[PDB]
PDB file of all heavy atoms in Angstrom:
ATOM      1  N   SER A  42      75.401  96.527  19.984  1.00  0.00           N
ATOM      2  CA  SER A  42      74.298  96.028  20.772  1.00  0.00           C
ATOM      3  C   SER A  42      75.037  94.982  21.951  1.00  0.00           C
ATOM      4  O   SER A  42      76.046  94.565  21.543  1.00  0.00           O
ATOM      5  CB  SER A  42      73.330  95.180  19.927  1.00  0.00           C
ATOM      6  OG  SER A  42      73.735  95.113  18.616  1.00  0.00           O
ATOM      7  N   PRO A  43      74.425  94.867  23.103  1.00  0.00           N
ATOM      8  CA  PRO A  43      74.942  93.816  23.909  1.00  0.00           C
ATOM      9  C   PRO A  43      74.399  92.485  23.583  1.00  0.00           C
ATOM     10  O   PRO A  43      74.613  91.480  24.403  1.00  0.00           O
ATOM     11  CB  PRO A  43      74.563  94.241  25.316  1.00  0.00           C
ATOM     12  CG  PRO A  43      73.238  94.909  25.092  1.00  0.00           C
ATOM     13  CD  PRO A  43      73.562  95.719  23.833  1.00  0.00           C
ATOM     14  N   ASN A  44      73.665  92.473  22.496  1.00  0.00           N
ATOM     15  CA  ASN A  44      72.646  91.629  22.131  1.00  0.00           C
ATOM     16  C   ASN A  44      73.205  90.236  21.814  1.00  0.00           C
ATOM     17  O   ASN A  44      72.612  89.106  22.042  1.00  0.00           O
ATOM     18  CB  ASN A  44      72.036  92.122  20.820  1.00  0.00           C
ATOM     19  CG  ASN A  44      70.600  91.928  20.578  1.00  0.00           C
ATOM     20  OD1 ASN A  44      69.734  92.645  21.281  1.00  0.00           O
ATOM     21  ND2 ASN A  44      70.238  91.051  19.742  1.00  0.00           N
ATOM     22  N   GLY A  45      74.482  90.249  21.116  1.00  0.00           N
ATOM     23  CA  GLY A  45      74.885  89.246  20.219  1.00  0.00           C
ATOM     24  C   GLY A  45      76.157  88.618  20.625  1.00  0.00           C
ATOM     25  O   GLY A  45      76.629  88.607  21.744  1.00  0.00           O
ATOM     26  N   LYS A  46      76.704  87.988  19.577  1.00  0.00           N
ATOM     27  CA  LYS A  46      77.900  87.289  19.592  1.00  0.00           C
ATOM     28  C   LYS A  46      78.808  87.638  18.455  1.00  0.00           C
ATOM     29  O   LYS A  46      78.466  88.644  17.973  1.00  0.00           O
ATOM     30  CB  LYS A  46      77.576  85.695  19.529  1.00  0.00           C
ATOM     31  CG  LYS A  46      76.858  85.249  20.801  1.00  0.00           C
ATOM     32  CD  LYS A  46      76.892  83.744  20.906  1.00  0.00           C
ATOM     33  CE  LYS A  46      78.167  83.269  21.552  1.00  0.00           C
ATOM     34  NZ  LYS A  46      78.271  83.412  22.939  1.00  0.00           N
ATOM     35  N   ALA A  47      79.898  87.061  18.317  1.00  0.00           N
ATOM     36  CA  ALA A  47      80.864  87.355  17.231  1.00  0.00           C
ATOM     37  C   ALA A  47      80.192  86.834  15.899  1.00  0.00           C
ATOM     38  O   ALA A  47      79.430  85.844  15.910  1.00  0.00           O
ATOM     39  CB  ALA A  47      82.154  86.621  17.463  1.00  0.00           C
ATOM     40  N   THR A  48      80.520  87.411  14.759  1.00  0.00           N
ATOM     41  CA  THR A  48      80.061  86.938  13.546  1.00  0.00           C
ATOM     42  C   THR A  48      80.613  85.534  13.143  1.00  0.00           C
ATOM     43  O   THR A  48      81.665  85.170  13.508  1.00  0.00           O
ATOM     44  CB  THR A  48      80.362  87.884  12.295  1.00  0.00           C
ATOM     45  OG1 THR A  48      81.780  88.022  12.308  1.00  0.00           O
ATOM     46  CG2 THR A  48      79.820  89.307  12.689  1.00  0.00           C
ATOM     47  N   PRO A  49      79.769  84.809  12.441  1.00  0.00           N
ATOM     48  CA  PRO A  49      80.211  83.436  12.136  1.00  0.00           C
ATOM     49  C   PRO A  49      81.589  83.431  11.462  1.00  0.00           C
ATOM     50  O   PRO A  49      82.249  82.535  11.728  1.00  0.00           O
ATOM     51  CB  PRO A  49      79.146  83.096  11.086  1.00  0.00           C
ATOM     52  CG  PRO A  49      78.004  83.674  11.593  1.00  0.00           C
ATOM     53  CD  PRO A  49      78.390  85.030  12.076  1.00  0.00           C
ATOM     54  N   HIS A  50      81.833  84.275  10.446  1.00  0.00           N
ATOM     55  CA  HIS A  50      83.160  84.369   9.894  1.00  0.00           C
ATOM     56  C   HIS A  50      84.309  84.655  10.742  1.00  0.00           C
ATOM     57  O   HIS A  50      85.341  84.061  10.752  1.00  0.00           O
ATOM     58  CB  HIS A  50      83.136  85.297   8.719  1.00  0.00           C
ATOM     59  CG  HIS A  50      82.464  84.768   7.371  1.00  0.00           C
ATOM     60  ND1 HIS A  50      82.114  83.433   7.299  1.00  0.00           N
ATOM     61  CD2 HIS A  50      82.078  85.337   6.290  1.00  0.00           C
ATOM     62  CE1 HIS A  50      81.499  83.249   6.152  1.00  0.00           C
ATOM     63  NE2 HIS A  50      81.501  84.396   5.505  1.00  0.00           N
ATOM     64  N   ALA A  51      83.987  85.545  11.871  1.00  0.00           N
ATOM     65  CA  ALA A  51      84.941  85.891  12.818  1.00  0.00           C
ATOM     66  C   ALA A  51      85.250  84.560  13.648  1.00  0.00           C
ATOM     67  O   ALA A  51      86.348  84.244  13.902  1.00  0.00           O
ATOM     68  CB  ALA A  51      84.391  86.885  13.792  1.00  0.00           C
ATOM     69  N   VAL A  52      84.264  83.877  14.013  1.00  0.00           N
ATOM     70  CA  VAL A  52      84.362  82.668  14.760  1.00  0.00           C
ATOM     71  C   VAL A  52      85.228  81.541  13.838  1.00  0.00           C
ATOM     72  O   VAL A  52      85.968  80.952  14.320  1.00  0.00           O
ATOM     73  CB  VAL A  52      83.001  82.079  15.097  1.00  0.00           C
ATOM     74  CG1 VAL A  52      83.319  80.711  15.774  1.00  0.00           C
ATOM     75  CG2 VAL A  52      82.342  83.071  16.025  1.00  0.00           C
ATOM     76  N   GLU A  53      84.903  81.488  12.694  1.00  0.00           N
ATOM     77  CA  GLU A  53      85.428  80.448  11.659  1.00  0.00           C
ATOM     78  C   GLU A  53      86.832  80.775  11.412  1.00  0.00           C
ATOM     79  O   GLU A  53      87.684  79.970  11.395  1.00  0.00           O
ATOM     80  CB  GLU A  53      84.683  80.506  10.412  1.00  0.00           C
ATOM     81  CG  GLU A  53      85.238  79.612   9.375  1.00  0.00           C
ATOM     82  CD  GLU A  53      84.445  79.424   8.030  1.00  0.00           C
ATOM     83  OE1 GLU A  53      83.356  80.043   7.978  1.00  0.00           O
ATOM     84  OE2 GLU A  53      84.952  78.785   7.092  1.00  0.00           O
TER      85      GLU A  53
END
Side-chain angles (χ1 to χ4, degrees):
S42 4
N44 217 80
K46 289 195 88 71
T48 58
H50 286 346
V52 176
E53 177 173 354

